[PDB]
Amino acid sequence: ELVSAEGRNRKAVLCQRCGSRVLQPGTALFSRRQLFLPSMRKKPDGDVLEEHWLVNDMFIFENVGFTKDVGNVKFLVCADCEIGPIGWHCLDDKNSFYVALERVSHE
Ligand SMILES: [Zn+2]
């Protein structure tokens, strides 16, 4: 109901806390890569997730925030309410941004 025949997101991706629109439908690819994401918290413990929306560029995002670059890694957070991490990003791989399905909502 969420992944298309082409493997894209059939529905819009949004923040589960405030409803902020993170991604428009059909702009990301489903990915089963294992990534550890600290438990959801305010911007300033976790889970190894294996279901993500793979985004090619941060410009593709509708609304999204990034944490202070630490260890070549930046966590994605809701741009509006700032709760996260809803995603993950390794700076070495400029064109790979991941948004964990469990950490977001869909409409
Ligand atoms: Zn939010």
From Swiss-Prot:
PROSITE patterns: MSS4. Zn(2+) binds at C15, C18, C78, C81. GO terms for molecular function: guanyl-nucleotide exchange factor activity; zinc ion binding. Keywords: Acetylation, Guanine-nucleotide releasing factor, Metal-binding, Protein transport, Transport, Zinc. Ubiquitous. Interacts with RAB8A. It comes from Rattus norvegicus. The keyword Protein transport applies. This is Guanine nucleotide exchange factor MSS4. One of its GO terms (cellular component) is cytosol.
